[PDB]
Enzyme design. Structure first.
Site, PDB file in Angstrom:
ATOM      1  N   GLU A   1     -31.379  36.979 -12.825  1.00 10.51           N
ATOM      2  CA  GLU A   1     -31.301  35.712 -13.558  1.00 10.51           C
ATOM      3  C   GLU A   1     -31.428  35.927 -15.064  1.00 10.51           C
TER       4      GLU A   1
ATOM      5  N   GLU B   1     -18.037  20.251   0.548  1.00 10.77           N
ATOM      6  CA  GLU B   1     -17.255  19.726   1.675  1.00 10.77           C
ATOM      7  C   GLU B   1     -16.663  20.825   2.562  1.00 10.77           C
TER       8      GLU B   1
ATOM      9  N   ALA C   1     -34.941  39.441 -12.253  1.00  7.68           N
ATOM     10  CA  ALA C   1     -34.189  40.479 -12.962  1.00  7.68           C
ATOM     11  C   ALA C   1     -32.726  40.101 -13.176  1.00  7.68           C
TER      12      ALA C   1
ATOM     13  N   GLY D   1     -62.067  30.595 -14.719  1.00  7.06           N
ATOM     14  CA  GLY D   1     -62.924  30.325 -13.569  1.00  7.06           C
ATOM     15  C   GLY D   1     -63.183  31.542 -12.704  1.00  7.06           C
TER      16      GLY D   1
ATOM     17  N   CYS E   1     -39.369  28.583 -13.762  1.00  8.74           N
ATOM     18  CA  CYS E   1     -38.157  27.834 -13.450  1.00  8.74           C
ATOM     19  C   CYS E   1     -37.611  27.116 -14.681  1.00  8.74           C
ATOM     20  N   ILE E   2     -38.462  26.322 -15.322  1.00 11.54           N
ATOM     21  CA  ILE E   2     -38.030  25.437 -16.410  1.00 11.54           C
ATOM     22  C   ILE E   2     -37.291  26.177 -17.538  1.00 11.54           C
ATOM     23  N   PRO E   3     -37.945  27.163 -18.197  1.00  9.92           N
ATOM     24  CA  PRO E   3     -37.234  27.885 -19.257  1.00  9.92           C
ATOM     25  C   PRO E   3     -36.112  28.794 -18.741  1.00  9.92           C
TER      26      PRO E   3
ATOM     27  N   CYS F   1     -44.108  28.240 -13.550  1.00 14.27           N
ATOM     28  CA  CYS F   1     -42.849  27.491 -13.494  1.00 14.27           C
ATOM     29  C   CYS F   1     -42.527  26.724 -14.779  1.00 14.27           C
TER      30      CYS F   1
ATOM     31  N   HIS G   1     -14.504  14.454  -0.989  1.00 11.61           N
ATOM     32  CA  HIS G   1     -13.456  15.128  -1.741  1.00 11.61           C
ATOM     33  C   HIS G   1     -13.285  14.533  -3.140  1.00 11.61           C
TER      34      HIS G   1
HETATM   35  C1  LIG Z   1     -39.213  33.812 -14.220  1.00 14.66           C
HETATM   36  C2  LIG Z   1     -39.461  33.192 -12.875  1.00 14.66           C
HETATM   37  C3  LIG Z   1     -38.541  32.257 -12.407  1.00 14.66           C
HETATM   38  C4  LIG Z   1     -38.866  31.416 -11.346  1.00 14.66           C
HETATM   39  N1  LIG Z   1     -37.937  30.497 -10.906  1.00 14.66           N
HETATM   40  C5  LIG Z   1     -38.230  29.653  -9.854  1.00 14.66           C
HETATM   41  C6  LIG Z   1     -37.281  28.727  -9.420  1.00 14.66           C
HETATM   42  O1  LIG Z   1     -36.271  28.517 -10.091  1.00 14.66           O
HETATM   43  N2  LIG Z   1     -37.580  27.884  -8.367  1.00 14.66           N
HETATM   44  C7  LIG Z   1     -38.813  27.953  -7.749  1.00 14.66           C
HETATM   45  O2  LIG Z   1     -39.071  27.198  -6.813  1.00 14.66           O
HETATM   46  N3  LIG Z   1     -39.756  28.869  -8.177  1.00 14.66           N
HETATM   47  C8  LIG Z   1     -39.479  29.727  -9.230  1.00 14.66           C
HETATM   48  N4  LIG Z   1     -40.426  30.648  -9.670  1.00 14.66           N
HETATM   49  C9  LIG Z   1     -41.716  30.824  -8.908  1.00 14.66           C
HETATM   50  C10 LIG Z   1     -42.760  29.791  -9.339  1.00 14.66           C
HETATM   51  O3  LIG Z   1     -42.945  29.875 -10.736  1.00 14.66           O
HETATM   52  C11 LIG Z   1     -44.097  29.990  -8.619  1.00 14.66           C
HETATM   53  O4  LIG Z   1     -43.881  30.029  -7.223  1.00 14.66           O
HETATM   54  C12 LIG Z   1     -45.119  28.892  -8.934  1.00 14.66           C
HETATM   55  O5  LIG Z   1     -45.282  28.747 -10.329  1.00 14.66           O
HETATM   56  C13 LIG Z   1     -46.478  29.214  -8.320  1.00 14.66           C
HETATM   57  O6  LIG Z   1     -47.393  28.174  -8.590  1.00 14.66           O
HETATM   58  P1  LIG Z   1     -48.982  28.420  -8.489  1.00 14.66           P
HETATM   59  O7  LIG Z   1     -49.714  27.142  -8.827  1.00 14.66           O
HETATM   60  O8  LIG Z   1     -49.368  28.915  -7.115  1.00 14.66           O
HETATM   61  O9  LIG Z   1     -49.308  29.542  -9.600  1.00 14.66           O
HETATM   62  P2  LIG Z   1     -48.989  29.330 -11.166  1.00 14.66           P
HETATM   63  O10 LIG Z   1     -47.809  28.413 -11.386  1.00 14.66           O
HETATM   64  O11 LIG Z   1     -48.748  30.678 -11.802  1.00 14.66           O
HETATM   65  O12 LIG Z   1     -50.333  28.683 -11.777  1.00 14.66           O
HETATM   66  C14 LIG Z   1     -51.536  29.417 -11.811  1.00 14.66           C
HETATM   67  C15 LIG Z   1     -52.201  29.295 -13.175  1.00 14.66           C
HETATM   68  O13 LIG Z   1     -53.586  29.561 -13.058  1.00 14.66           O
HETATM   69  C16 LIG Z   1     -54.043  30.295 -14.178  1.00 14.66           C
HETATM   70  N5  LIG Z   1     -55.162  31.196 -13.817  1.00 14.66           N
HETATM   71  C17 LIG Z   1     -55.085  32.463 -13.292  1.00 14.66           C
HETATM   72  N6  LIG Z   1     -56.339  32.937 -13.112  1.00 14.66           N
HETATM   73  C18 LIG Z   1     -57.221  31.995 -13.512  1.00 14.66           C
HETATM   74  C19 LIG Z   1     -58.613  31.964 -13.543  1.00 14.66           C
HETATM   75  N7  LIG Z   1     -59.296  33.101 -13.446  1.00 14.66           N
HETATM   76  N8  LIG Z   1     -59.251  30.832 -14.018  1.00 14.66           N
HETATM   77  C20 LIG Z   1     -58.519  29.746 -14.460  1.00 14.66           C
HETATM   78  N9  LIG Z   1     -57.138  29.790 -14.424  1.00 14.66           N
HETATM   79  C21 LIG Z   1     -56.496  30.895 -13.958  1.00 14.66           C
HETATM   80  C22 LIG Z   1     -52.835  31.039 -14.732  1.00 14.66           C
HETATM   81  O14 LIG Z   1     -52.844  31.004 -16.142  1.00 14.66           O
HETATM   82  C23 LIG Z   1     -51.633  30.299 -14.166  1.00 14.66           C
HETATM   83  O15 LIG Z   1     -50.923  29.619 -15.180  1.00 14.66           O
HETATM   84  C24 LIG Z   1     -40.118  31.498 -10.730  1.00 14.66           C
HETATM   85  C25 LIG Z   1     -41.037  32.439 -11.199  1.00 14.66           C
HETATM   86  C26 LIG Z   1     -40.717  33.283 -12.263  1.00 14.66           C
HETATM   87  C27 LIG Z   1     -41.645  34.419 -12.577  1.00 14.66           C
HETATM   88  C1  LIG Z   2      -6.354   7.451  -8.254  1.00  7.69           C
HETATM   89  C2  LIG Z   2      -7.030   7.528  -6.914  1.00  7.69           C
HETATM   90  C3  LIG Z   2      -8.152   8.343  -6.795  1.00  7.69           C
HETATM   91  C4  LIG Z   2      -8.624   8.715  -5.538  1.00  7.69           C
HETATM   92  N1  LIG Z   2      -9.735   9.527  -5.450  1.00  7.69           N
HETATM   93  C5  LIG Z   2     -10.228   9.908  -4.218  1.00  7.69           C
HETATM   94  C6  LIG Z   2     -11.352  10.731  -4.143  1.00  7.69           C
HETATM   95  O1  LIG Z   2     -11.782  11.282  -5.156  1.00  7.69           O
HETATM   96  N2  LIG Z   2     -11.840  11.111  -2.908  1.00  7.69           N
HETATM   97  C7  LIG Z   2     -11.218  10.682  -1.752  1.00  7.69           C
HETATM   98  O2  LIG Z   2     -11.658  11.025  -0.657  1.00  7.69           O
HETATM   99  N3  LIG Z   2     -10.102   9.867  -1.823  1.00  7.69           N
HETATM  100  C8  LIG Z   2      -9.595   9.471  -3.051  1.00  7.69           C
HETATM  101  N4  LIG Z   2      -8.470   8.655  -3.129  1.00  7.69           N
HETATM  102  C9  LIG Z   2      -7.875   8.070  -1.873  1.00  7.69           C
HETATM  103  C10 LIG Z   2      -6.912   9.055  -1.205  1.00  7.69           C
HETATM  104  O3  LIG Z   2      -5.925   9.443  -2.137  1.00  7.69           O
HETATM  105  C11 LIG Z   2      -6.251   8.458   0.042  1.00  7.69           C
HETATM  106  O4  LIG Z   2      -7.247   7.960   0.912  1.00  7.69           O
HETATM  107  C12 LIG Z   2      -5.383   9.466   0.803  1.00  7.69           C
HETATM  108  O5  LIG Z   2      -4.443  10.068  -0.061  1.00  7.69           O
HETATM  109  C13 LIG Z   2      -4.627   8.788   1.943  1.00  7.69           C
HETATM  110  O6  LIG Z   2      -3.865   9.739   2.653  1.00  7.69           O
HETATM  111  P1  LIG Z   2      -2.630   9.285   3.584  1.00  7.69           P
HETATM  112  O7  LIG Z   2      -2.000  10.502   4.220  1.00  7.69           O
HETATM  113  O8  LIG Z   2      -3.079   8.298   4.636  1.00  7.69           O
HETATM  114  O9  LIG Z   2      -1.576   8.591   2.580  1.00  7.69           O
HETATM  115  P2  LIG Z   2      -0.926   9.374   1.329  1.00  7.69           P
HETATM  116  O10 LIG Z   2      -1.845  10.444   0.790  1.00  7.69           O
HETATM  117  O11 LIG Z   2      -0.578   8.372   0.254  1.00  7.69           O
HETATM  118  O12 LIG Z   2       0.428  10.026   1.910  1.00  7.69           O
HETATM  119  C14 LIG Z   2       1.494   9.211   2.342  1.00  7.69           C
HETATM  120  C15 LIG Z   2       2.818   9.722   1.791  1.00  7.69           C
HETATM  121  O13 LIG Z   2       3.883   9.268   2.605  1.00  7.69           O
HETATM  122  C16 LIG Z   2       5.000   8.921   1.808  1.00  7.69           C
HETATM  123  N5  LIG Z   2       5.784   7.823   2.420  1.00  7.69           N
HETATM  124  C17 LIG Z   2       5.563   6.472   2.311  1.00  7.69           C
HETATM  125  N6  LIG Z   2       6.512   5.818   3.021  1.00  7.69           N
HETATM  126  C18 LIG Z   2       7.338   6.727   3.583  1.00  7.69           C
HETATM  127  C19 LIG Z   2       8.460   6.600   4.398  1.00  7.69           C
HETATM  128  N7  LIG Z   2       9.083   5.426   4.476  1.00  7.69           N
HETATM  129  N8  LIG Z   2       9.114   7.740   4.828  1.00  7.69           N
HETATM  130  C20 LIG Z   2       8.663   8.992   4.452  1.00  7.69           C
HETATM  131  N9  LIG Z   2       7.547   9.104   3.643  1.00  7.69           N
HETATM  132  C21 LIG Z   2       6.893   7.992   3.214  1.00  7.69           C
HETATM  133  C22 LIG Z   2       4.456   8.569   0.430  1.00  7.69           C
HETATM  134  O14 LIG Z   2       5.296   9.093  -0.575  1.00  7.69           O
HETATM  135  C23 LIG Z   2       3.076   9.203   0.385  1.00  7.69           C
HETATM  136  O15 LIG Z   2       3.030  10.274  -0.534  1.00  7.69           O
HETATM  137  C24 LIG Z   2      -7.983   8.273  -4.378  1.00  7.69           C
HETATM  138  C25 LIG Z   2      -6.860   7.452  -4.501  1.00  7.69           C
HETATM  139  C26 LIG Z   2      -6.382   7.078  -5.757  1.00  7.69           C
HETATM  140  C27 LIG Z   2      -5.321   6.020  -5.831  1.00  7.69           C
END
Ligand SMILES: Cc1cc2nc3c(=O)[nH]c(=O)nc-3n(C[C@H](O)[C@H](O)[C@H](O)COP(=O)(O)OP(=O)(O)OC[C@H]3O[C@@H](n4cnc5c(N)ncnc54)[C@H](O)[C@@H]3O)c2cc1C
Ligand SMILES: Cc1cc2nc3c(=O)[nH]c(=O)nc-3n(C[C@H](O)[C@H](O)[C@H](O)COP(=O)(O)OP(=O)(O)OC[C@H]3O[C@@H](n4cnc5c(N)ncnc54)[C@H](O)[C@@H]3O)c2cc1C
Lengths: 586, 586
Positions: free
Chosen positions: B293, B569, B291, B221, B152-154, B147, B564
């Site tokens: 990845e 979501e 392969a 070992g 994983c890392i590289p 890993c 949102h």
């Molecule tokens: C390219 C690739 C991508 C991967 N990506 C992910 C991922 O993104 N996410 C994830 O969860 N897993 C990933 N894996 C899997 C992960 O690497 C393995 O599941 C994990 O490393 C296994 O750990 P281990 O300790 O059982 O064996 P290892 O990590 O291989 O460690 C065993 C070590 O023991 C040593 N050894 C062997 N024989 C002897 C001995 N005779 N005496 C002393 N030392 C010895 C070896 O040199 C080896 O380095 C990936 C694997 C590969 C091949």
């Molecule tokens: C800049 C900013 C960033 C935000 N970011 C997030 C976020 O990332 N995630 C998140 O979950 N929430 C976010 N929010 C909050 C979110 O926008 C509000 O909670 C949501 O829009 C409320 O919905 P509503 O229907 O109750 O009111 P509104 O979405 O405001 O709708 C009410 C509408 O009714 C209209 N209206 C008003 N009075 C009348 C009337 N007299 N007659 C007819 N129409 C009328 C208005 O024009 C208005 O457009 C953010 C808010 C702001 C200000």
């Protein structure tokens, strides 16, 4: 039982059925051919379905299926519905109503459009009203609400453009030959791309309402009485439309501080996302998530940014996490005017309308120590909170109860003090003001009203993400709120710093990205709050919100195997407690 | 009970204590001052602690605390331990052993180092053995395992460098002025940055073992008998070391196809991550995640890449998701030689050692239709699976049972057919071959052996992420495996396409990013499998693995509010079933 009394009374068009019954299928296809939308309750799929059949006779005098109901009244069985269809009477029977609409939604935003579309699916004649009152400078937008036009969507897109700035820096370390000297950002080019997508969303909602047979009216709505809504169109023509159920979803608008030159010369988030000119040297007054998000991406796009803070950052959020958010910003080009308040904004230059250039303003203020603030800024953005404007939307004589903040006092099913009137989203008092919250509440309310659902919106443990330069995702209670609720002795906090693998070759910071689990000792180490600072915090936090909803413990986090290499896997191997005093550093 | 019999026998240095007892604290600080590491069992913190106190008398003849044990033998109470300390005898008492070490770990990788560090924490005299057998071309690396050095890392760092290629493309759409003509990638510059980080990890593990007092031996070992391990150092000096407990964690090495010119001219993932030259026009033979990845990031770094596939992609994974992974790759510069197998590799150019340039090879093969494959490639990478090499590590006379694949047959607590010998990681038969799995198994086994723990490693529902151009994260069963297990009638699949908000302004694809929940109808719609195709899939999937571990249902996903705007979501608002026939498109 009483559920059936509420279901029959409220549903526009509903069919009580069994999935096995041939007569029920006969009615289903007849309604489908006539294009009559309706809700369907399958009684063989319910545990108490036999008890409901018996209770139907209190409304219909029959206990068999199918049974069709329209707006509180029994319409007929299998033969009766087919009688209406053969005589071409069925269309007039299903359209029969006391009011112009079954549902009128005032506000075409996150919650409003979600409630409107969902209601129309079950045959409720729905009309959505949306009007955007222009900002002091005259900025207006299309259908979609705050999130779509001036909220989440344009915020995260500009956040992404700010994220690309540091992707350009990292690329060089990852082997890419790049001349970063002679690389600049064009604000207007970004805005055009952002507004082009918002325009497709505005058009997308119009088509969706047209496809769902929802009557969209670009008009200002005003509920003069429980069932009457006064509408004023673009031509200033005033008329009245009637609706059985009323959903208030008008949302909020940004607040201005009561200081000279604030309304005239300063702007808000409403103006920023479609701003024809680059803000330039910018002052952001406020410490909310909106304030820090806006100031975050402006600094990343090469802007001279200063944030004026009255007291503390992110009030309501975890203050340890809020400090870590601000510390990262300060170390990455964001200046902070700490313990400072504005007094007045005075114009030095008028906004160049033809060259698309910012004006110039001088901001006078004062620090808590008595020192005077006097600095020039090309743009002043106010982010000092948002307020409901329901005085424009409701005549006080209707009887809709509001709190001291002006937000609607609602029951757990979003019912106002007027029984047919409901409120969802930002105007619902005491509820998390987020987009998914409004949509969940809107859809679920529409299902209860017209489809006979019982499911309520769960407002507890709603996960959030502040999209600052370094993102902060949180689900549940802050550390200080959990200590206040249960005592310091009942709280155990597991925490650790982490470094994204992406940051290693990029030569970015150690021990800056941070995560913690706030747990309750007496409740099997129950995860009360999850907090994470780092890249893609929203993607990290989301999955855990499902676990926390199910009542996740520290043991559940421990037995779950991580995914390597990710930032989120650090949650699975947490061991360092805050009470031990051991340093959380890697 | 019998737990105490196993705990006392196996633990190197252990102290049975109560957190309230002053005499127990007296012994704790004496052992801390003398720097004697040990495990501590607090009996007042356990439910059956009073029953254990009574059972201690079967080993010590006393029922009080504290009670100190060293390697199966009762050492003394409070006065006895202090007697050893005052007479300077304590150091000789705690070091008293039948063998040279309490634990010998053969293999210094993911599981091996995790087991070694954890064991030393509880006072087990630990020695870790690590030897990297050079590849056919002579590529070797430092301490850390697969890993860290060639896994994983590289892999993800080069995946990130490939991700930056498309961050450069997106930046232009987000407003950044960039001249992408005259932007190229330097492979060697990237490799140097990757190998510099691996070097810090190699050094990091050496220091960590030194800090934990673990004896690191860079030696090959060989377990000649249950307790004897033969070691061969860098000087070819042969000697024998003895250990009470033996942990086999030797891992696997890449396989070569038995064809002329494969070993001589072709390379593997072992060679690729430290390759002094750019692969150039590359052929990747295989269809594993390794392969796809490797072929993924090579194409993103401007490489002419072709993948030779025998039959299907990602065997073992969800084949609908595996096709979607391959479809994205094919549409983004990755060529596929479908239904093709290699016959021979013949050299046309020798690798330029001084100019750091690739050679040239001609690959002869054949398709299933009879057509001949004959194309020239600068680099040929073989990714046709990995195999354990335990014939080099165990003499058949010890009695360690292996399966038909050459992997160790183990119990649920990782015990081999030789009671003191244990196997973890990739060599453990039938276990998910991942890094966190090996570390969890290593740490948990070390805790059971020396700290008296009972917690076993849960190998079920381990979440994975294939870091292809478009990442694929999965937790649980594939759709085809869930149908085979429970029948098609008992399976409901909720699915939907999605588009990241980042992709909108960037003008990237609609309806390509995809997610699904495979659910069991009879078990309250239990989420059997989660599958997601999209950016940051590892960050998305992780949180859900905790929920699935707790037995998440579709209702649990529904009641959880989304964040949102995120990609994750979309899991909260899934409604379209596969049985309905409704299109999953947005
Ligand atoms: C390219 C690739 C991508 C991967 N990506 C992910 C991922 O993104 N996410 C994830 O969860 N897993 C990933 N894996 C899997 C992960 O690497 C393995 O599941 C994990 O490393 C296994 O750990 P281990 O300790 O059982 O064996 P290892 O990590 O291989 O460690 C065993 C070590 O023991 C040593 N050894 C062997 N024989 C002897 C001995 N005779 N005496 C002393 N030392 C010895 C070896 O040199 C080896 O380095 C990936 C694997 C590969 C091949
Ligand atoms: C800049 C900013 C960033 C935000 N970011 C997030 C976020 O990332 N995630 C998140 O979950 N929430 C976010 N929010 C909050 C979110 O926008 C509000 O909670 C949501 O829009 C409320 O919905 P509503 O229907 O109750 O009111 P509104 O979405 O405001 O709708 C009410 C509408 O009714 C209209 N209206 C008003 N009075 C009348 C009337 N007299 N007659 C007819 N129409 C009328 C208005 O024009 C208005 O457009 C953010 C808010 C702001 C200000």
């Amino acid at each position: 039982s009483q559920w059936l009394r509420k279901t029959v009374d409220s549903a526009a068009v509903i069919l009580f059925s069994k999935t096995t019954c041939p007569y029920c299928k006969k009615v289903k296809d007849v309604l489908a051919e006539a294009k009559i939308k309706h809700a369907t309750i399958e009684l063989d799929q319910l545990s108490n379905g036999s008890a409901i059949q018996k209770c139907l006779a209190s409304f219909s005098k029959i206990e068999t299926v199918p049974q069709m109901f329209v707006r509180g009244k029994f319409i007929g069985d299998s033969q009766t519905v087919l009688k209406y269809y053969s005589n071409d009477e069925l269309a007039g029977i299903v359209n029969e109503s006391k009011y112009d609409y079954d549902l009128i939604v005032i506000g075409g935003g996150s919650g409003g459009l979600a409630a409107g579309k969902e209601a129309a699916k079950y045959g409720a004649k729905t009309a959505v009203l949306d009007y955007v009152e222009p900002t002091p400078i005259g900025t207006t937008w299309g259908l979609g609400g705050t999130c779509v036009n001036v909220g989440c969507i344009p915020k995260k897109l500009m956040h992404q453009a700010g994220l690309l700035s540091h992707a350009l820096e990292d690329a060089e370390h990852f082997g890419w030959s790049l001349d970063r000297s002679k690389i600049s950002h064009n604000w207007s080019t970004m805005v055009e791309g952002v507004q082009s997508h918002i325009g497709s969303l505005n058009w997308g909602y119009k088509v969706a309402l047209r496809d769902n047979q929802v009557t969209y009216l670009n008009a200002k709505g005003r509920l003069i009485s429980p069932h009457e809504v006064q509408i004023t169109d673009k031509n200033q023509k005033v008329s009245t439309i009637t609706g059985n159920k009323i959903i208030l979803a008008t949302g909020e608008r940004p607040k201005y501080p009561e200081i000279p030159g604030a309304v005239e010369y300063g702007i808000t988030s409403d103006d920023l996302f479609s701003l024809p000119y680059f803000p330039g040297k910018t002052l952001v007054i406020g410490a909310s998530y909106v304030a820090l998000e806006c100031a975050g991406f402006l600094a990343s796009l090469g802007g001279d940014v200063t944030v004026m803070v009255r007291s503390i950052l992110l009030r309501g959020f975890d203050q340890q996490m809020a400090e870590k958010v601000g510390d990262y910003m300060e170390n990455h080009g964001v200046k902070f005017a700490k313990l400072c308040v504005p007094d007045e904004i005075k114009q030095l230059k008028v906004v160049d309308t033809e060259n698309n250039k910012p004006g110039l303003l001088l901001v006078k203020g004062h620090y808590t120590d008595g020192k005077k603030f006097e600095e020039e800024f090309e743009t002043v953005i106010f982010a000092v909170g948002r307020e409901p404007q329901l005085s424009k939307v409701l005549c006080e004589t209707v009887g809709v109860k509001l709190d001291k903040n002006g937000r609607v006092v609602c029951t757990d099913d979003e019912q106002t003090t007027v029984s047919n009137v409901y409120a969802i989203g930002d105007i619902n008092a005491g509820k998390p003001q987020l987009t998914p919250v409004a949509i969940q509440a809107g859809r679920y309310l529409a299902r209860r009203l017209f489809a006979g659902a019982t499911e309520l919106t769960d407002y507890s443990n709603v996960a959030t993400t502040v999209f600052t330069p370094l993102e902060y995702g949180a689900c549940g209670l802050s550390e200080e709120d959990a200590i206040e609720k249960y005592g310091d002795k009942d709280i155990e906090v597991y925490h650790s710093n982490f470094k994204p693998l992406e940051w290693t070759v990029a030569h970015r910071e150690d021990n800056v990205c941070y995560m913690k689990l706030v747990c309750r000792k007496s409740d099997n180490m129950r995860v009360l709050g999850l907090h994470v600072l780092g890249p893609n915090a929203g993607e990290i936090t989301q999955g855990y919100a499902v676990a926390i909803k199910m009542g996740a413990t520290k043991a559940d986090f421990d037995r779950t195997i991580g995914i390597h290499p990710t930032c989120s896997e650090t949650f699975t191997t947490l061991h360092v407690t805050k009470k031990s005093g051991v340093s959380p550093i890697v």
